[PDB]
Amino acid sequence: QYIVARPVYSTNAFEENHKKTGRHHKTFLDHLKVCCSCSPQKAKRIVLSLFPIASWLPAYRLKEWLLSDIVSGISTGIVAVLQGLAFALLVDIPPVYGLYASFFPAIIYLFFGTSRHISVGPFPILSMMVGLAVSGAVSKAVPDRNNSSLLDDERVRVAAAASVTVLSGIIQLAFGILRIGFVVIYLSESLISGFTTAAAVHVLVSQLKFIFQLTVPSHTDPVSIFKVLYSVFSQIEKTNIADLVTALIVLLVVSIVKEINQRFKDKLPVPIPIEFIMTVIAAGVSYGCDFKNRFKVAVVGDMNPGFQPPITPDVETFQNTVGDCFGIAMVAFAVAFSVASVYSLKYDYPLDGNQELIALGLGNIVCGVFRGFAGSTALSRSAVQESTGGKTQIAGLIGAIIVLIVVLAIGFLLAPLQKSVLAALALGNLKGMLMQFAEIGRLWRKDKYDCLIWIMTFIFTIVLGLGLGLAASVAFQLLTIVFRTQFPKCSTLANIGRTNIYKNKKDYYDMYEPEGVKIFRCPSPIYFANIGFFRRKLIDAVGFSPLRILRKRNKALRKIRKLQKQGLLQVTPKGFICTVDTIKDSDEELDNNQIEVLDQPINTTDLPFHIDWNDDLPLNIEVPKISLHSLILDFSAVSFLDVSSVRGLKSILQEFIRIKVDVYIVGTDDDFIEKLNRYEFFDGEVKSSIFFLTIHDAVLHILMKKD
Amino acid sequence: QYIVARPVYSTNAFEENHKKTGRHHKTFLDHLKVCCSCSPQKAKRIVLSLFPIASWLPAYRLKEWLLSDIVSGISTGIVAVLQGLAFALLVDIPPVYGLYASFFPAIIYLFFGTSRHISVGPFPILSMMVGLAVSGAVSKAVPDRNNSSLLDDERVRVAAAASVTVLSGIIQLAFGILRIGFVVIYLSESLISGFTTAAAVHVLVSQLKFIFQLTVPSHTDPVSIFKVLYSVFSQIEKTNIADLVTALIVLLVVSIVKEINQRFKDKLPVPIPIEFIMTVIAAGVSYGCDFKNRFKVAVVGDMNPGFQPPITPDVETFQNTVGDCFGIAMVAFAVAFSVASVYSLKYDYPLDGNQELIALGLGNIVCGVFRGFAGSTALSRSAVQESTGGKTQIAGLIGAIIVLIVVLAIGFLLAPLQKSVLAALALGNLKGMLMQFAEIGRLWRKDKYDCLIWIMTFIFTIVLGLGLGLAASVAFQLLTIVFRTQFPKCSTLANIGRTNIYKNKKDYYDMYEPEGVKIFRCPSPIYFANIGFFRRKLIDAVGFSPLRILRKRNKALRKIRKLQKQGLLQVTPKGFICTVDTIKDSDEELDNNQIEVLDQPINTTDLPFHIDWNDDLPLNIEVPKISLHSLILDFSAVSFLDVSSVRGLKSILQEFIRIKVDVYIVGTDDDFIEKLNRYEFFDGEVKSSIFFLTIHDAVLHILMKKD
Ligand SMILES: CC(C)CCC[C@@H](C)[C@H]1CC[C@H]2[C@@H]3CC=C4C[C@@H](OC(=O)CCC(=O)O)CC[C@]4(C)[C@H]3CC[C@]12C
Ligand SMILES: CC(C)CCC[C@@H](C)[C@H]1CC[C@H]2[C@@H]3CC=C4C[C@@H](OC(=O)CCC(=O)O)CC[C@]4(C)[C@H]3CC[C@]12C
Ligand SMILES: CC(C)CCC[C@@H](C)[C@H]1CC[C@H]2[C@@H]3CC=C4C[C@@H](OC(=O)CCC(=O)O)CC[C@]4(C)[C@H]3CC[C@]12C
Ligand SMILES: CC(C)CCC[C@@H](C)[C@H]1CC[C@H]2[C@@H]3CC=C4C[C@@H](OC(=O)CCC(=O)O)CC[C@]4(C)[C@H]3CC[C@]12C
Ligand SMILES: CC(C)CCC[C@@H](C)[C@H]1CC[C@H]2[C@@H]3CC=C4C[C@@H](OC(=O)CCC(=O)O)CC[C@]4(C)[C@H]3CC[C@]12C
Ligand SMILES: CC(C)CCC[C@@H](C)[C@H]1CC[C@H]2[C@@H]3CC=C4C[C@@H](OC(=O)CCC(=O)O)CC[C@]4(C)[C@H]3CC[C@]12C
Ligand SMILES: CC(C)CCC[C@@H](C)[C@H]1CC[C@H]2[C@@H]3CC=C4C[C@@H](OC(=O)CCC(=O)O)CC[C@]4(C)[C@H]3CC[C@]12C
Ligand SMILES: CC(C)CCC[C@@H](C)[C@H]1CC[C@H]2[C@@H]3CC=C4C[C@@H](OC(=O)CCC(=O)O)CC[C@]4(C)[C@H]3CC[C@]12C
Ligand SMILES: Cc1c(CC(=O)O)c(=O)oc2c(C)c(OCc3cccc(C(F)(F)F)c3)ccc12
Ligand SMILES: Cc1c(CC(=O)O)c(=O)oc2c(C)c(OCc3cccc(C(F)(F)F)c3)ccc12
């Protein structure tokens, strides 16, 4: 049983009876003296936050982790070599520059990174974005000033890729220093699903150059994918059959083996390395049977051993690639943080979002100085490193050691590799991204505001491209928040069961509603896109407009005074005795510059008899009549207000108070009423006595005030 | 006194006891059969909505309104002539093409418009936008193929202005047909104040060409205002003193007269026409004293009488002015609707927002065909028409008649008008726009989220220009809504006074909190930018993490089973009798691909003795202990959810239920729980029995369930 015996409280009488604690407000300056004030155990936290390898490496369990890290590092270093060779073709540079992208960030992240299960390298979507930024940069360059010229057009693409990488790393490091690594929260799940599904189609289309062995120019556009499709299918009579059959065989075999490893995650230690076995088989059969001369297949060429000397970044490339580098930096950090958060939740260790930006930015800067291209983690390579038994970032060190031993020593192998095997290995990781097409039907019957976000993200990314489509999709996703709260379902309430329960007036059968009281609920925060709808729904829920009846009352009072000081109608302390039956009954029209005296509050204290405005006026004067005398506003679900709302609500309440209708606001916490004091909302007319605790408090106050 | 005696209801037991009405849901098709089904009194509403002149003109009070409309129309037609001559210089076309912009939209709006106090013409900000769009269009044109060539560069500006006008009218009419005239609600008051204050500075800077009589090229840029300032101040030694003294005298006189008319709005019928008197004086003294030859002043030239033949709009201009015409159409409709709403509220007549778009678009199309430029109402001209006694749109007809009689007959006057008097008349209306600089200090101490909107709107409009700055400002204003709800102040509640009142635990002195119960409140809607903060604040408010203690309980159960089926520890229906004191105390490590068996729910029904997890386990096993057994979530202020929130909340509640903690959600209406059924939120684990009416219902349910 629910039994309550209580006084009726009114948010001002409540705080008279209950002593508040009193908490000191923190202004701008004590935050400053709290932050910049050093201590011998304060700098030793910041330094260990900047170098986490000083914290995890002495706490290294040797006997449990070393033999697992060795095996995990070898098996992910092989995949890092092959994926680095494959993703350099998506930037259209020589393939040895993808091996440099798999070495330097994995060394910098070993010192400055906080994740333990992430392999750092390149991944296909970011390589497509870097290639688009490069071919957009070499077409905006100044034209400054016979036989070997198609090796010098790849010498400028390498420098453009290095400069784009250095600028993206600088943007990432500057975002990490300014401690704004919370920007991943502006990306909902529907936006990520739509972007991922469209970018999988981008990746699938851009691999058709190498499976068919066709020559496609460097389209950089809004509508790049359809131009690439037109350039491929205009010349499909010139394909190479030996490059197509091999890609089909490799894709089929790694597809039916890469799902045995998920069907049989138990029963089977160290899952089957199929990207290594198929590469060994393909490069061994392309040698010996002489595939480069029997057929005419494209191969990975002769890579020269060693590293390159450092480069100096071109500021002319920095001038006209800024909007591309911002998108590259944001996409790289968002992908890396989302992949690292899964294993951080799975193995229960903390993940610093601001240290990831510093580590990835430093890795990208050092990679771009030594002529690599940009990157962060890949989902498939991280899954290979984790599913083999990777416990920490020693596995990334051993993967970088294997990449180094391929660069320095054994790069004379992988010279008969057939360059469409490398394109078919990158298509084996598109299953989980393309299976997200079955989310339009799921989101259709659940929200319909996130289905719209999915469809608009897909369309913007397909039509506008990977960089500008994400920027358009974030803005549309912010529009849907305003769409959710434009027209809230406002309702009137009534009492059920003669108790303190008040629900919707249309929903139940024998609800009671007290005489002259109107309860109105708006289930949404009221802001600038919301206040005219609120005012319209309130004055249609109450039956009339208070400004119109105030104007008609002022007109009737003006006619009463005009007949009065002619000495026609008598004035008594009780009665309003008239003299004549009918007057000429004019409809006196007052012009502009005077029509706004009808909005003034009525002050009839000069007249002794109290006027009613609800019985009939003494001669044929026809002001309308209302039955309302009290209005409750249920503000429980109203989260915040702003300046437009405070002005509109102030106008509404001033119009209701001047027509002699008492207004009560009900259901707010103390932060709301404290914020309303800063807007200068209260004055001599709208007091602070209008706030009550619950609806039943206001109704019980009304039902004993009016008797 | 507040006395309630009631049963304890739980939102499922409430609806068993109270019969709901049952309302039929309206799907997609019955809306279609409701809308497209004609009637002989349905088409007669749509036709009278499309032609409001068939409704107001037979209801015309002749004796009250005719003599006021004549005087208002004459006095606003003079101002329309002078402002049309003045604003054509801001597009840099000959001045006779501003008289055509003051004639045709005022005739089309007489038939298709719903306002009664609006004068339709040009206004300065839209003329600056049209001029920028024109000079951007003539620089992107194809270059296709000696003495008189500076009259043919103004022949292309006229055609560009006409084409920009026709495209803007087409966009306006198409927006009005599609019934989307509610787009004015996306503009808050702070954005409008910042945009207006920056555009006043734009208007003030662009009038310096004519006061000083300097030659400035057509800068179209992001940063146009600073380039215009540099081009003016590089050559200020070449100014004309007779053009500066005259502009100063005219500006001073109309400034001190245009505020007498506000100080003396009473006492004074038909306010003083000072823009007419100063124009007559200036053009009469420039004649006779021969100002064109004594000094070297620029004058309004010889305008040829008559109208021009119709033009055909160039589609090449349509190709590269789309983003300009969208901004022109939106700014014109927003300004016209905001100015008309003031008089619609003042005189109590309805205003159709979708008919305004059709009327303004038709007027702009007809104006652009006959070589005028675009426009809508101006605030100063509308104030002149209203303050003289304008009752309806007959005053606009008489103003158009006076513009016609200037075009056809008496355009040989205003030939000695001095062209800086026209620039000084446009500066007399900048006082109310420049006085809005005292809103940074007002908004600073009130909201601080709208001060940011003001400052960013000012900076974006000054730096990027009038068209792109508004588009950037709308997006930043949408960002501030997410900024308001990123980190909501979540709190825990407690009971005051041993009644049904629950407030913040830190705020009062002798609050009670029941043993083992935790009440948690989030005062905001929970969406994608909000759910990780909610989960973090909830698991720091409750004292622990439920997933970690579930994993430790599963580890302890695995060690118990491993010691059990070795036959070491005995198993009883009551007791857990052991055998040995100490075992080897391993810390058994299970690898990846098996670590996710620790998140499974505990099912110890194979064991007869009930395990406690809160006393000590029989040997040295050290699972942590919790005191919580019930958790209330106060969801009163939670307005909506989305897919990310439903997934995160589902994970949180599943983690709390598996650790044997009962969860209650409290304070939601029926629309919330009806929307939660569509997300497939409920299953065999998370039931619908967890919803209660109020906090005291859930607390009273707990306090009798646990005894
Ligand atoms: C209404 C919402 C739901 C989607 C809005 C999509 C638009 C922003 C897209 C759709 C069609 C697109 C156009 C489709 C085709 C072209 C031609 C294209 O040029 C060429 O293909 C020829 C020249 C060249 O090869 O570069 C330049 C971009 C453009 C104008 C596109 C610009 C962007 C547009 C207008
Ligand atoms: C179905 C949705 C996702 C898109 C709807 C619009 C498409 C049907 C349009 C918009 C972009 C258009 C493409 C824009 C650019 C080009 C390049 C253009 O390349 C040329 O060689 C141009 C000159 C020539 O025709 O010879 C050929 C047409 C094509 C593929 C267009 C084909 C029709 C496309 C795909
Ligand atoms: C917003 C801040 C706190 C963090 C992010 C910093 C970036 C926005 C900055 C840092 C490096 C800057 C770049 C450093 C060097 C240059 C070259 C400089 O241009 C030239 O020197 C051009 C030649 C000339 O001066 O005429 C200015 C632009 C640019 C690309 C800068 C653009 C802005 C960048 C990317
Ligand atoms: C907290 C974060 C979100 C702040 C982000 C700020 C950026 C939006 C700003 C800061 C620095 C700006 C850059 C500063 C300078 C330039 C150089 C400018 O190029 C020139 O000036 C070329 C001609 C010349 O050299 O004079 C192009 C814009 C750009 C990259 C600006 C683009 C906009 C940037 C990146
Ligand atoms: C960080 C937030 C608060 C404001 C971001 C403002 C930027 C978007 C602005 C500020 C500085 C602006 C730049 C200032 C100066 C110039 C030079 C200007 O070129 C010239 O003046 C020379 C060539 C010519 O005369 O056309 C081109 C625009 C640009 C790069 C502007 C581009 C837009 C910028 C980067
Ligand atoms: C104070 C806030 C509102 C702006 C902060 C940045 C300004 C100090 C910058 C940004 C834009 C700049 C302007 C961009 C373009 C030009 C045109 C440029 O015109 C020329 O004649 C260029 C060649 C030459 O120098 O001879 C002269 C400098 C100026 C006015 C620049 C002056 C410095 C400005 C105003
Ligand atoms: C979104 C809809 C429901 C309302 C608003 C309509 C506008 C977005 C439409 C109506 C008129 C259209 C224009 C009509 C004519 C043309 C010319 C046409 O371009 C050409 O003919 C160029 C030459 C060539 O075809 O090669 C397509 C673009 C454009 C500017 C169109 C752009 C889109 C406009 C402005
Ligand atoms: C309900 C409202 C908000 C819808 C708004 C839709 C607009 C954003 C779309 C609809 C029509 C689109 C236009 C359709 C066609 C063109 C022509 C296109 O120019 C060309 O195609 C030039 C080359 C050629 O002729 O092939 C430039 C973009 C533009 C104006 C598009 C710009 C984007 C527009 C205005
Ligand atoms: C390339 C790639 C492949 C191939 C491979 O394995 O290398 C894959 O398998 O999955 C991917 C997924 C799921 C990706 O989505 C992550 C994400 C997470 C948050 C935010 C965003 C953002 F919207 F910002 F892009 C993206 C992205 C990229 C891949
Ligand atoms: C030119 C002009 C002048 C000179 C003259 O009188 O002719 C003036 O006196 O006042 C103006 C005011 C207040 C203006 O602001 C209206 C508004 C209303 C809603 C929305 C927007 C938007 F943000 F879309 F622009 C603008 C605009 C323009 C003027």
Same domain, residue pair B496 and B451: no
Locus of tokens 């809005």: B436
User: Is B700's CB within 8 Å of A2's CB?
Assistant: yes
How far, in Å, CA of B520 to CA of A324, rounded? 44
Question: Long-range contacts made by residues B671-679, C-beta under 8 angstroms, separation at least 24?
Answer: B671/A489, B671/A523, B672/B635, B672/B638, B672/B641, B673/B11, B675/B640, B675/B641, B676/B641, B676/B646, B678/A445, B678/A446, B678/A447, B679/A446, B679/A447, B679/B641, B679/B643, B679/B646
Sequence-distant (6+) residues with CB within 8 A of A315 are none
Choose among B200, B201, B199, B208: nearest CA to B228.
Answer: B208
**Strand pairing partners for B512?**
B495
The binding-site residues of ligand 8, defined as CB within 6 angstroms of any ligand atom, are B 319, 322
Distance, CA B159 to ligand 7 centroid (Å)?
A: 18
Dist. CA B697–CA B701, nearest whole Å: 6
Tell me how many residue pairs between chain A and chain B have CB atoms under 8 A apart: 227
A517 touches A702 (CB < 8 A): yes
All residues of chain B having their beta carbon less than 8 Å from the beta carbon of residue A18 are 496-497, 508-509
Distance from CA of A185 to the nearest CA of B (A): 5
* Interchain proximity B643–A18, CB inside 8 Å: no
* Cβ A126 vs Cβ A376: under 8 Å: yes
Residues A95, A220, single domain; the answer is yes
The alpha carbon of B622 and the centre of ligand 3 are apart by a number of angstroms equal to 57
φ/ψ of residue A452, rounded to 5: -65, -40
DSSP A455-471: HHHHHHHHHH-HHHHHH
Lookup: tokens for B220: 């179209």
Structure tokens at A614: 């609800």
- The two structure tokens encoding residue B261: 């008319």
Asked whether the beta carbons of residue B523 and residue A21 sit closer than 8 angstroms, the reply is no
Same domain, B197 and B264: yes
Q: If you measure from the C-alpha of residue B159 to the centroid of ligand 8, how many angstroms do you get, rounded to a whole number? A: 22
> Ligand 3 centre and the CA of A156: distance in Å?
21
Closest CA to A431 of A254, A264, A277, A263: A254
What distances in angstroms separate CA A101 from CA A159, A203, A306, B250, one per listed residue? 14, 19, 14, 70
Burial classification of residue A585, based on how many CB atoms lie within 10 Å of its CB (0-12 exposed, 13-18 middle, 19 or more buried)? exposed
| Domain membership of residue B499 as a residue range | 491-544+626-705
Chain B nearest-CA residue for A23: B507
The span from the CA of B122 to the CA of B322, in Å, is: 20
Q: Which of A439, A39, A1 is nearest to B7 (CA)?
A: A1
Strand ordering across the sheet containing A517-521: A502-504, A491-495, A517-521, A630-634, A662-666, A691-692
Q: Both tokens of residue A595?
A: 């029509």
Q: What are phi and psi of B630, to 5 degrees?
A: -150, 145
Question: Whose CA is closest to B114, among B327, B402, B347?
Answer: B347
Neighbours of B21 (CB within 10 A): 9
Give the CA dihedral B436, B437, B442, B444, nearest 10 degrees: 130
Residues of chain A found within 8 Å of residue B669, distances taken between Cβ atoms: 503-504, 523
Which B positions 579-598 lie with beta carbon below 8 A of chain A? Answer: 589, 591-593, 595-596
Supply B54's token pair.
């068939």
Asked if residue B40 belongs to a domain, the reply is: no
DSSP state of B89: G
Tell me, letter by letter, the H, E, C secondary structure of B290-305.
CHHHHCCCCCCCCCCC
CA B70, CA B397: separation in Å to the nearest integer? 10
Please state, as a whole number, how many other Cβ atoms lie within 10 Å of the Cβ of residue B92: 17
Residue B482 CB neighbour total at 10 angstroms? 17
Elucidated via: cryo-EM
Which residues contact residue A72 at a Cβ distance below 8 angstroms, ignoring those fewer than 6 apart? Answer: A385, A388, A389, A390, A391, A395, A398
Whether A603 is covered by a domain: the verdict is no
Q: Classify the C-alpha dihedral B651-B657-B660-B663 as positive or negative.
A: positive
The answer to whether the CB atoms of A639 and B485 lie below 8 A apart is yes
Largest CA distance in chain B: 126
DSSP conformation letters of A93-118: S-GGGGTTTTTHHHHHHHHH---SS-
Which single residue is written with the structure tokens 């606003």?
B76
Alpha helices in B258-321 (DSSP H): 260-263, 274-286, 291-294, 315-319
CB contact burial A282-311 (16+ within 10 A = b; e otherwise): bbeebeeeebeeebebebbeebeeeeeeee
Residues 6+ apart with CB under 8 A from B176: B354, B355, B356, B357, B358, B361
Cα–Cα distance measured from residue B195 to residue B472, given in angstroms and rounded to the nearest whole number: 11
Dig out the tokens for B543 from the structure: 């004292």
A525 neighbourhood in chain B, CB within 8 Å:
525, 639
- Give me the amino acid identity at A447: D
Distance (Å) from CA A221 to ligand 3 centroid: 24
Residue A201 in any domain: the answer is no
What value, to the nearest 5°, has the Cα angle with vertex A666 and ends A665 and A668?
A: 105
CB spacing of A509 vs B346 below 8 angstroms: no
Instruction: List own/partner pairs for A353-356 with CB under 8 A and 24 or more apart.
Output: A353/A181, A353/A182, A353/A184, A354/A176, A354/A179, A354/A181, A355/A49, A355/A50, A355/A52, A355/A112, A355/A113, A355/A114, A355/A176, A356/A113, A356/A114, A356/A115, A356/A176, A356/A181
Handedness of CA A165, A168, A174, A176 (dihedral sign): negative
Between the CA of A222 and the centroid of ligand 8 the distance, in Å, is 13
Chain B residues with CB inside 8 Å of A485's CB? Answer: 639-640
Q: For residue A431, what are the contacts with CB-CB under 8 A and spacing of at least 6?
A: A255
Strands B517-521 and B502-504: unpaired
Read off the tokens for A502: 């008040």
Cross-chain CB nearest to B2 (options A4, A23, A481): A4
Q: Give the C-alpha distances (Å, rounded to integers) separating A314 from A138, A317, A321, A365, B435.
A: 12, 5, 11, 14, 48
CATH of the domain at B518: 3.30.750.24
For residue A171, which ligand has an atom nearest its CA? 3
Q: Are residues B166 and B287 in the same domain?
A: yes
CA A247 and chain centroid, separation: 39
Is A595 a member of any domain?
no
Of B2, B591, B671, the CB nearest to A8: B2
SS3 B401: helix
Please identify, by atom number, the ligand 6 atom nearest to the C-alpha of residue B463: 3
CA distance B473 to B191: 7
Domain contains B28: no
DSSP states of B359-376 as a string? HHHHHHHHHHHTT-----
Please report whether residue B245 resides in a domain: yes
> Do the domain assignments include residue B608?
no
Q: Please list, in sequence order, all residues whose beta carbon lies within 8 angstroms of the beta carbon of residue B650, skipping any fewer than 6 positions away.
A: B681, B686
CB contact under 8 A, A642 and B696: no
Give A23's contacts in chain B (Cβ within 8 Å): 506
Which among B77, B109, B217, B88 has a CA at the least distance from the CA of B162?
B88
At B16, phi and psi to the nearest 5? -75, -30
With beta carbons less than 8 A apart as the criterion, state whether B354 and B113 touch: no
Long-range contacts of B669-673 (CB under 8 A, 24+ apart): B669/A503, B669/A504, B669/A523, B670/A503, B670/A504, B670/A507, B671/A489, B671/A523, B672/B635, B672/B638, B672/B641, B673/B11
Protein residue with least CA distance to atom 15, ligand 6:
B227
Q: How far is CA A108 from the centre of its chain?
A: 29
Give the separation between CA A79 and CA A386, rounded to whole angstroms: 13
B327 CA to middle of ligand 8, Å? Answer: 14
CA nearest neighbour of A667 among B494, B632, B502, B701 = B502
Residues of A with Cβ-Cβ distance to B504 under 8 angstroms: 669-670
Q: What are phi and psi of A4, to 5 degrees?
A: -135, 125
Q: Which of B221, B223, B224, B229 to mutate to test the pocket of ligand 6 (most atoms within 8 A of CB)?
A: B223
In a domain, B48, yes or no: no
Query: Are residue A371 and residue A519 in the same domain, yes or no?
Result: no
C-beta of residue A2 within 8 angstroms of C-beta of residue B2? no
Q: Do B446 and B511 belong together in one domain?
A: no
**Distances B601 to B82, B156, B549, B654 between C-alpha atoms, Å:** 83, 78, 12, 10
Locate tokens 């000081």: which residue? A565
* In a shared domain, residues A319 and A253: yes
Class of residue B589 by CB neighbours under 10 A (exposed 0-12, middle 13-18, buried 19+): exposed
Residues B406, B526: one domain?
Answer: no
Q: How far is CA A21 from the centre of its chain?
A: 38
Return the number of other C-beta atoms located less than 10 Å from residue B558's C-beta.
14
Domain boundary among A437, A452, A482: A437
Cβ separation A479–B478 shorter than 8 A: yes
**B636/A637 CB distance under 8 A:** yes
Put residue B680 in one of left, alpha, beta given phi > 0 → left and psi -120 to 50 → alpha: left
Q: Are B186 and A644 in contact (CB under 8 A)?
A: no
* Cα dihedral: B476, B477, B481, B486 (round 10): 30
Same domain, yes or no: A332 and A419? yes
* Boundary residue ending a domain (A398, A420, A437): A437
DSSP state of A377: B
Minimal-distance CA residue to ligand 2 atom 6: A463
Asked if B389 and A591 come within 8 Å (Cβ–Cβ), the reply is yes
Q: Whose CA is nearest to atom 4 of ligand 3?
A: A174
Instruction: Tell me how many domains chain A contains.
Output: 2
Which of A267, A240, A310 shows the shortest CA–CA distance to A100? Answer: A310
The answer to whether residues B362 and B399 belong to one domain is: yes
**A609 touches B at CB < 8 Å:** no
Same domain for B523 and B460, yes or no, is: no
Question: Of A417, A437, A457, which one is at a domain's C-terminal end?
Answer: A437
Q: Which of A450, A643, A678 to mutate to test the interface with B (most CBs of B within 10 A)?
A: A643
Nearest residue by C-alpha to atom 4 in ligand 10 = B429
**Cα separation of B358 and B50, whole Å?**
9
Rounded Cα distance, B514 and B276, in Å: 80
Q: Using the beta-carbon criterion (under 8 Å), do A643 and B680 form an inter-chain contact? A: no
**Do B360 and B402 share a domain, yes or no?**
yes
Which residues in chain B (251-280) have CB-CB distances under 8 A to chain A?
265-266
